[PDB]
Design a protein around this ligand. Structure first.
Ligand SMILES: [Zn+2]
Length: 259
DNA sequence: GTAGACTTGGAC
DNA sequence: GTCCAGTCTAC
């Protein structure tokens, strides 16, 4: 889940939990709990608090309670669902929040990579993992200048720069590949080699790509140009789409539209 | 920077 | 059976 999917989860989940009061917290896989370290303390402190809201920062979900904020990162496969506490749980359910009205918020995660941090609302933004995140892509804080400032000061590929949550937050493998294609830039090239003209266009395609994705509720998979299409013809020039590895990850691109 | 880990299931 | 799918930490 990248920014578009997490934003979709946020909008759907909020009306289902706002106003509900936590009666119990059950944890079946302790390692997901990062702070406080003791999973027993994590559970005890939330009991009695009511859900006041749900926000998003980068790829993180921020559950706003009475005094605390629960910061959740879904990583690769984490997922949330609301259901009746009288029914049996689905496989791979690792954390459950039971509400006083008989309902519950279930957290599933097959690979167990997700993390959960709890801090007082006022400390959240100044403590890890939210402290060092870059600006939100769909806000005035993200501008060509910001990208250029970070770009012209590193030898790594442009794709590595965009995957760095401290440069800009919310972009993942799918939308980095799609944005680079639309801007017409090869992923594996030095970020320092990009021109003012290139950086500006990229900034523009990034904003437009992530914006459209949210409106379509995320993967919008019918609107992908390169991700997952290795071997198939380019939708604009017809050249077969290629796949290699860059920044330690699968990377898709068109050798003709991208330079 | 391209790995090395954490950890489970589906494709071929 | 072997290859593929967002951070942290490390040769
Ligand atoms: Zn093309």
């Amino acid at each position: 889940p990248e920014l578009p999917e997490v934003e979709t989860i946020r909008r759907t989940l909020l009306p289902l939990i706002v106003g509900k009061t936590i009666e119990d917290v059950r944890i079946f896989w302790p390692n997901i709990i990062r702070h406080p370290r003791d999973s027993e303390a994590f559970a005890a402190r939330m009991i009695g608090q009511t859900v006041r809201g749900l926000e998003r920062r980068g790829k993180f979900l921020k559950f706003l309670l009475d005094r605390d904020a629960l910061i959740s990162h879904l990583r690769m496969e984490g997922r949330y669902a609301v259901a009746s506490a009288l029914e049996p749980l689905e496989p791979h359910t690792h954390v459950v929040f039971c509400f006083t009205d008989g309902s519950e918020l279930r957290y599933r995660d097959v690979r167990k990579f997700g993390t959960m941090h709890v801090y007082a609302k006022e400390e959240a933004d100044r403590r890890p993992p939210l402290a060092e995140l870059g600006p939100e892509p769909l806000s005035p804080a993200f501008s060509p200048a910001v990208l250029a400032e970070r770009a012209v000061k590193t030898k790594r590929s442009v794709k590595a720069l965009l995957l760095d949550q401290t440069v800009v937050a919310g972009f993942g493998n799918i939308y980095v590949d799609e944005s680079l294609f639309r801007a017409g830039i090869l992923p594996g090239r030095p970020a320092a080699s990009l021109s003012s003209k290139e950086i500006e266009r990229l900034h523009e395609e990034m904003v437009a790509t992530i914006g459209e994705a949210v409106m379509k509720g995320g993967s919008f998979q019918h609107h992908l140009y390169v991700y997952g299409r290795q071997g198939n013809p380019c939708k604009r020039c017809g050249t077969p789409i290629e796949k290699t590895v860059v920044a330690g990850r699968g990377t898709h691109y068109c050798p003709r539209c991208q330079r």
